Amino acid sequence: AVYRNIQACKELAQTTRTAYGPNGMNKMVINHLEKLFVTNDAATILRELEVQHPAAKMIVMASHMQEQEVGDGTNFVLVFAGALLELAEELLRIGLSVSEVIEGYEIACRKAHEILPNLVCCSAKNLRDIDEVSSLLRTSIMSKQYGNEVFLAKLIAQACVSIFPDSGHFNVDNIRVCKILGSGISSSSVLHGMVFKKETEGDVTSVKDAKIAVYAEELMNFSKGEENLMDAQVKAIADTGANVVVTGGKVADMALHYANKYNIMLVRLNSKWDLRRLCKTVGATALPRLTPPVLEEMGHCDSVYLSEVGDTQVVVFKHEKEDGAISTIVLRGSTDNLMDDIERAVDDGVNTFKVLTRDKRLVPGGGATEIELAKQITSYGETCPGLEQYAIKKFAEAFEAIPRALAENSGVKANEVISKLYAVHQEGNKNVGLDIEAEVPAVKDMLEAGILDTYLGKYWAIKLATNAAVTVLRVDQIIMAKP
Amino acid sequence: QAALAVNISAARGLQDVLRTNLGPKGTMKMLVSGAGDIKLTKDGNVLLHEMQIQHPTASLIAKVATAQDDITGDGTTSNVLIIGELLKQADLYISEGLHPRIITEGFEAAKEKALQFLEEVKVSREMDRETLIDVARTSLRTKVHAELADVLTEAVVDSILAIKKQDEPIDLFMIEIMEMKHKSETDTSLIRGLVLDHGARHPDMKKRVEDAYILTCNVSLEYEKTEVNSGFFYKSAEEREKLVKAERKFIEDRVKKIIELKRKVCGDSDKGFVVINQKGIDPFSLDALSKEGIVALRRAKRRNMERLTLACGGVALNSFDDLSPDCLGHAGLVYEYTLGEEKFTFIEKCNNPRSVTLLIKGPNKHTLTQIKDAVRDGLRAVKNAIDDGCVVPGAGAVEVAMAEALIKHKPSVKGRAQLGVQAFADALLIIPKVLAQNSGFDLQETLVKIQAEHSESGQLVGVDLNTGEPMVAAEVGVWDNYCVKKQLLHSCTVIATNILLVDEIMRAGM
Amino acid sequence: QAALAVNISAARGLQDVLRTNLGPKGTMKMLVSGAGDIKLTKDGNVLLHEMQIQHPTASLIAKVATAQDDITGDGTTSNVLIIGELLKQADLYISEGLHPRIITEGFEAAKEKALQFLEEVKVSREMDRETLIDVARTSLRTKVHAELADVLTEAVVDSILAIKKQDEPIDLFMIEIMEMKHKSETDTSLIRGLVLDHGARHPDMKKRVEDAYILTCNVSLEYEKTEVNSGFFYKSAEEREKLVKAERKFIEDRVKKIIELKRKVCGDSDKGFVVINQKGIDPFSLDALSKEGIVALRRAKRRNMERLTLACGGVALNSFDDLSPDCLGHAGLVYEYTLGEEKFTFIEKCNNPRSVTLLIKGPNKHTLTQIKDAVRDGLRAVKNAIDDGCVVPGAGAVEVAMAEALIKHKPSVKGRAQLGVQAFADALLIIPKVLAQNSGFDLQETLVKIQAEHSESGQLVGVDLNTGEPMVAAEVGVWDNYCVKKQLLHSCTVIATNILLVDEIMRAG
Ligand SMILES: Nc1ncnc2c1ncn2[C@@H]1O[C@H](COP(=O)(O)OP(=O)(O)O)[C@@H](O)[C@H]1O
Ligand SMILES: Nc1ncnc2c1ncn2[C@@H]1O[C@H](COP(=O)(O)OP(=O)(O)O)[C@@H](O)[C@H]1O
Ligand SMILES: Nc1ncnc2c1ncn2[C@@H]1O[C@H](COP(=O)(O)OP(=O)(O)O)[C@@H](O)[C@H]1O
């Protein structure tokens, strides 16, 4: 019952085999909440595509580890692992054992970790400039949202440069993205602090308060008593001194009058996820009752005011006296489906440089370093005696499936690409990757184009991918139990 | 006779199942729980005690590993393989017309000859650090990916030596197991003291204290009920909060003596104090003790308070009215390590805590629970090596040397009993045959190789899992416990007796 | 591997069929021809050569026993028993993953080791009356119903001893086997002379002749064609009678030519004359020769004329015009034997016949055919005993001693072939397991006692069928031939080598 596990993981790769690269195909994602989505992100497929075959889940948990400590290489987990087991079936057809093949991959993983630093050609300059971040973030824009290589390269760079001076404090949790209905990507902008699209309900312009609190005769008597009840609540807020009150629910017409009576800025936020962002930044939590005057659950902010950017009244929550490391990228888009696809490409770019906060090392992509890595591992496999030759030799051919995906997804023949990728590297022309062109099957230097991946990303992508192929091959039979 | 053939063919299938997961070259098996949890493991006891089997007969064999795990904790994989091959060989003799009872007496005679031969192979050498390293490597290899072999070998061995001295009887309760995420699998290490789950929640607590005194208590310092014969005599809601302070007055005064106990017991600088109260503490009470630099913990488990008495020495106090410095413990570098998810307190650097904690680190739960199985399986093998100083060479060296003895053994009980000895000898030889397939070598080449080795002195050869050559298991560092092999000769024969003694099968309401 | 499992279980079923007819205490098998013929026998050659089996794989094993019976003449039942057990034990290792090629190498080593073991235990005892009776007891006991043992034992022994002198090799054509009905089964004895089917039938013949000169002839004494340039031409029935007067001159004148030779060669009293002409004879020639004390026989077989030349010594004649005294023979007592219905000629007490007659007697047809094969199977067992000066002990005593030599034997060629020797050891021990069941005793308890028998000497131990204890086959008079076991181990290894090496079974038309 071993091949049934290989056929299970083989099918999971063929779905994301086409979503790889910039010319990859989109996916008709039907959400469980009676919603329709269209994208080409491989990470979102598995979240919705419920693969119940537990043999393939080991590859998914490896892809989930590709989200921790790194934010790229998800296709590497599914493609490289899926190609490893496809060729592993060719070995067992001859009559090889499972342990010798596992041990051969355990050795090849150590040989691959030593060749990758040799192929590190260039890296970042560590200047904290906008041209440095935008020029290198072109790799994150690839295969997540094509065509916006110019727009998002500078937009993402503007939010990270504000935090790079805070050495060792750059995080993806500090960059919260917002999206507003608009014409297109041209109306996008970048702002500091937390910016929310909802306008200010009150007529208060600016306030530097730190206290931010997030939340027939008888017929006319109780109707006016409610007006005294609401006034007593804003008076309770005035007793606390909170000039900025963030409302999670609905606001009465009389509350707008009392909010301006005591000079209290009143802001409404219907989105719960936007309210959760305030819990982790200023310290103010959302209380369920009608405005509890709890001075302990109020946050701390140096300045709060209303702004208008792109013809949209938006409230600003920045920190002038403190250091400040929060940035908000406000994108504009007419279609909510495609507008969210851009939101994911932004998170992919923020996390790419979050790993570059460590030792900055980059490797060219596009089939350049993967064949150079497969060319050197094959050299160790030819001279290394013993029965490990069949596993190490095929471990190099597993690296070939990735440029084969870049070839087929680009409409280019897969065999002609690898034949030319091996000829240029036989002559020593390193850093030569496949040129993205539907008509030109030729190749060129990717370093001259400005395509550079993360050295620290390929490490964990090759390790988690090979360890998953070991975990799936060690299990030769799946047996059900009833607790 | 056809009714007996069912139990034979029933365990034959269970033999083909648990034969591929023996040794490090063997395969793993998955446990599909159906609720959302997946487990990976090699130990046969885990594949049967928690698993439910299709056939009814094989379900009885599952209880053998349940009783076997309580004695030794290992070897359950090889127990079913000996049982599967015994009844496989016995079927060839019953097919000719022999009764099963005659074959059982043959095994009863082979048990003594095989058990008596065990006295010669075992070695009474002194167990030391270099000897147990050979033992831990033999067990943990079958539970990891050939990478955590040297990592966990040094942890399990040092955990045992640090909790047993002067021929003291050892116990497994002294070793606590902990798991943590957001780390790599090769970062497994040991802890001098005990890692606590719930820490302190206040910014004014000392992140790490080089030296602090411990105080064991079970008094809740939160807003508690009334202790004396009184009540809530009030007239409005504002007066209700006034008597809340009265129910807190008995609580607030008890915390003021804690500061007095700290000031009297080393109230000078370069000192510290750490409270280990199991019950909750109010944020106001923590605010009073945090000013003095007292790192007070709350919401701990009952198991840690019992271990805290052994590690720290502070005696549990039930009331602060009887607060005395006699029940004060002591700890070394008391700190709280910051991880990616939560914070956990450490009380390491104790002189003799009589309890260690093997801190396991892994990214996934199925990987974290797999190593948890390797710890308890690797620890008991070393527990059986020290409590029983006699150990034997693995690699099937005991089974092959025993099998060679049974062929050269005359009938000392009965005449036809020799046939069962011929079958019991061919059963023990399945261990080198099983490991030959998991290694990928020829099943027959491995057998005659280790069998062709003869000399005029002690010569116990074994299987080379990597090459297949006949290799000495004693020199390369492979050793097994005396009680493990002892139970195989008693479990496999007693169980195989009960299966062959079944004549007919009747449905009692099924 | 599946191509072997169909062939493996095909022999296992064939093992359970023929195991119940090994030895005397075993059962018999019936042969239903469908036309009306029914037969009973234990010899495996008849259960496989004349019988039709459903499986083609088992049909190939039938041709092995057919050729085995042509060489040694016995032991074909145990040949298939070892074959069925060789593949049974080979399947135990094939399930573990051993290729059949290495197992054949193990049988090749044990076959040569066991063949060397026969050279050590074989006994070159002198051939005489007392020793051959012990051998013929082994061959005929398994072909009868435990009553014709002592009866037929003396027959086959003295039959071969009569035709063996001057170091001449043995020939089976020197024995004329005849059958007689209307008598009991225990009356089977030996006839020194030759028995003829048809004899003289006339009242004027002598009942017995103490001494007579036998004249060999081949001349036709019935109505024949014209011997001169003429033919049969007539016009009526009366004219046809005149041609009888002419044609009979060629027959009647030849009767007197025998009378002229009678008065010439010993025409006095105390003498006799016997004509053994192969052709038919007219009654006028019988009456003419019967009065002269001349016994005229007719309707003899072609082979009987060949033996008749040896009995008396008279050379075969083809014409009475070429008659001479040189072709006259001589014999002793010549008489006629009387059965319930028919009568036969007996010319016993010959001078130098060099050809004996084993006269079989039985009341039924199906029972006479059972003894028909036991004679050919009994004569050939002792034939190999004298031609092969060495013999081996019976009672399955070779198998239990062979198991001791092969277990105490390591291959000097490779290691993995040692297991093929282990299988060949348990395959040879099936014979004491089979006979223990045919005797009605426990299968394994009989094997323990014969295997446990050991001593500091050369000890031959076998199987006792009457009690079940260890029996020394040399002390009880239980012996076999040396060529039987030699052909057994030489044959059974070749067939197991040819079948186990079959990788696939393709349907070729
Ligand atoms: N235009 C391009 N030129 C060269 N390589 C590309 C291009 N577009 C995508 N790639 C390759 O595709 C790989 C996957 O990119 P990305 O989508 O950011 O990660 P993931 O596939 O894990 O989401 C990168 O390693 C990169 O080398
Ligand atoms: N490479 C090896 N060399 C020698 N012996 C081995 C090897 N691998 C496994 N064994 C033997 O297999 C036996 C059982 O191991 P394991 O499966 O871990 O325990 P259990 O069978 O009780 O679950 C051990 O006693 C050990 O001697
Ligand atoms: N009464 C007996 N007890 C023990 N062994 C016997 C007995 N009769 C025959 N045998 C053995 O059985 C074998 C086969 O004998 P036989 O019947 O003559 O050949 P087959 O069985 O092939 O017809 C012989 O080798 C002989 O040693």
Six-digit token pair at B453? 């080795």
Tell me, what CATH number does B402's domain have? Answer: 1.10.560.10
Six-digit token pair at A322? 């403190």
Residue of B nearest to C449 (CA): B415
Are residues A83 and A59 in contact, defined by beta-carbon separation less than 8 angstroms?
A: no
Please provide residue C259's backbone torsions phi and psi, each rounded to the nearest 5 degrees: -70, -35
Overall CATH class of domain A193-324: alpha beta
Judge residue C503's burial from the number of C-beta atoms within 10 Å of its C-beta, 0-12 exposed, 13-18 middle, 19 or more buried: exposed
Give the residue numbers spanning the domain of B404.
1-125+390-506
- Whether C302 and C380 share a structural domain: no
Interface with chain B: mutation pick from A107, A463, A471, highest number of B CBs within 10 Å: A471
Q: 3-state class of B501 per DSSP? A: coil
Six-digit token pair at B74? 């290992």
Residue C246 zone, left/alpha/beta (φ > 0; ψ -120 to 50; rest): alpha
Are residues B330 and B214 in contact, defined by beta-carbon separation less than 8 angstroms?
A: yes
DSSP E strand stretches across A172-326: 175-181, 189-192, 194-196, 206-207, 212-214, 244-247, 265-268, 303-308, 313-318
Are residues A442 and A435 in contact, defined by beta-carbon separation less than 8 angstroms?
A: yes
- Whether C318 and C464 share a structural domain: no
Residue C468 has a CB neighbour count (10 Å cut-off) of: 17
DSSP E strand stretches across A58-138: none
- Whether C416 and C367 share a structural domain: no
- Whether C18 and C59 share a structural domain: yes
Are residues C175 and C192 in contact, defined by beta-carbon separation less than 8 angstroms?
A: no
- Classify domain A2-123+361-480 at the CATH topology level: GROEL; domain 1 (1.10.560)
CB neighbours of B60 closer than 8 A, spacing ≥ 6? none
Active-site annotation holder among B69, B134, B282, B377: B377
Encode C225-239: b = buried (16+ Cβ within 10 Å), e = exposed.
Answer: eeeeeeeeeeeeeee
- Whether B367 and B404 share a structural domain: no
A63 touches chain B (CB under 8 A): no
Q: 3-state class of C190 per DSSP? A: strand
Beta strands C213-215 and C273-275: pairing type?
A: parallel
Q: Helices (DSSP H) in A308-388: which residue ranges?
A: 336-355, 369-383
CA–CA dist B51, B59 (Å, integer): 9
Q: C482-500 and C76-94 are packed helices; what angle lies between their axes, rounded to 10 degrees? A: 40
Kindly list the partner chains of chain B, i.e. chains with 3 or more CB atom pairs below 8 Å: A, C
Closest residue by Cα to residue C299 from C279, C283, C316: C279
Please provide residue B248's backbone torsions phi and psi, each rounded to the nearest 5 degrees: -85, -20
Residue type at C148 in one-letter notation: L
Residue B23 has a CB neighbour count (10 Å cut-off) of: 23
- Interface size between A and B, measured as CB pairs under 8 A: 74
- Which uninterrupted H or E stretch holds C471? strand C470-471
Tokens 């080393």 appear where? B266
Residue A50 has a CB neighbour count (10 Å cut-off) of: 7
Q: A369-383 and A389-409 are packed helices; what angle lies between their axes, rounded to 10 degrees? A: 160
Query: What is the experimental method?
Result: cryo-EM
Is the sign of the CA dihedral A79, A85, A86, A91 positive or negative? positive
Q: What angle do CA B203, B205, B209 make, to 5 degrees?
A: 145
- Which uninterrupted H or E stretch holds B41? strand B38-41
Q: How far is CA B50 from the centre of its chain?
A: 16
Q: B76-94 and B482-500 are packed helices; what angle lies between their axes, rounded to 10 degrees? A: 40
Closest residue by Cα to residue B102 from C451, C445, C440: C445
User: Cα of A161 to ligand 1 centre, how many Å?
Assistant: 24
Six-digit token pair at C219? 């001349």
Structure letter (DSSP) for residue A162: T
Is there a shared CATH topology between the A124-192+325-360 domain and the A193-324 domain? no
Shortest-distance ligand to the CA of residue B485: 2
- Which uninterrupted H or E stretch holds B359? strand B356-361
The neighbouring-strand residues paired with B391 are B123, B481
Q: Helices (DSSP H) in A280-368: which residue ranges?
A: 336-355
- Whether B213 and B137 share a structural domain: no
Tell me, what CATH number does C173's domain have? Answer: 3.30.260.10
Are residues C401 and C461 in contact, defined by beta-carbon separation less than 8 angstroms?
A: yes
- Whether B442 and B456 share a structural domain: yes
- Whether B35 and B17 share a structural domain: yes
- Whether B208 and B146 share a structural domain: no
Contact yes or no for C97 and B443 at CB 8 A? yes
CA–CA dist A191, A194 (Å, integer): 8
Domain coordinates in residue numbering, chain A: 2-123+361-480, 124-192+325-360, 193-324
Contact yes or no for A483 and B364 at CB 8 A? no
| Rg (chain C; Cα; Å) | 30
Residue A427 has a CB neighbour count (10 Å cut-off) of: 8
CA–CA dist C329, A151 (Å, integer): 136
| Rg (chain B; Cα; Å) | 30
Six-digit token pair at B237? 């809601």
Active-site annotation holder among B41, B57, B77, B446: B77
Q: 3-state class of C222 per DSSP? A: coil
Number of structural domains chain C divides into: 3
Encode A196-219: b = buried (16+ Cβ within 10 Å), e = exposed.
Answer: bbbebbbebeeeebbbbbbbeeee
Contact yes or no for C418 and B445 at CB 8 A? no
Q: Has C377 been annotated as catalytic?
A: yes
Six-digit token pair at B333? 């570098």
Q: What are the Cα distances from residue C181, in Å, to A214, C40, C187, C339, C376?
A: 127, 19, 11, 8, 19
Residue type at B291 in one-letter notation: K
CB neighbours of B159 closer than 8 A, spacing ≥ 6? B175, B190, B356, B358, B379
Q: How far is CA C148 from the centre of its chain?
A: 16
Q: 3-state class of C177 per DSSP? A: strand
CA–CA dist C37, C159 (Å, integer): 31
Please provide residue C369's backbone torsions phi and psi, each rounded to the nearest 5 degrees: -75, -30
Six-digit token pair at A10? 């083989």
**What would you measure as the largest C-alpha separation in chain B, in angstroms?**
102
Q: What are the Cα distances from residue A97, in Å, to A103, A474, B26, B142, B395?
A: 10, 11, 10, 16, 20
Closest residue by Cα to residue A197 from A391, A336, A330: A330
Q: Which of B411, B437, B444 sits opposite C98 (nearest CB)?
A: B444
CB neighbours of C50 closer than 8 A, spacing ≥ 6? C31
CATH number of A124-192+325-360: 3.30.260.10
DSSP E strand stretches across A193-301: 194-196, 206-207, 212-214, 244-247, 265-268
Q: 3-state class of A96 per DSSP? A: coil
- Whether B218 and B245 share a structural domain: yes
Contact yes or no for B440 and A54 at CB 8 A? no
- Whether B137 and B116 share a structural domain: no
Are residues B292 and B203 in contact, defined by beta-carbon separation less than 8 angstroms?
A: no
CB neighbours of A366 closer than 8 A, spacing ≥ 6? A403, A406, A433, A434, A435, A436, A446, A451
CA–CA dist A214, A297 (Å, integer): 8
| Rg (chain A; Cα; Å) | 28
CA–CA dist C45, C24 (Å, integer): 16
Are residues A429 and A107 in contact, defined by beta-carbon separation less than 8 angstroms?
A: no
- Whether C10 and C101 share a structural domain: yes
Q: What angle do CA C451, C452, C456 make, to 5 degrees?
A: 105
CB neighbours of C130 closer than 8 A, spacing ≥ 6? none
DSSP class per residue in B256-293:
HHHHHHHHHTT-SSS--EEE--SS-B-HHHHHHHHTTT
Q: Which residue, of C333, C367, C389, is where some domain finishes? A: C389
Structure letter (DSSP) for residue B476: T
Is the sign of the CA dihedral B61, B63, B66, B67 positive or negative? negative
- Which uninterrupted H or E stretch holds B40? strand B38-41
CA–CA dist A257, C241 (Å, integer): 167
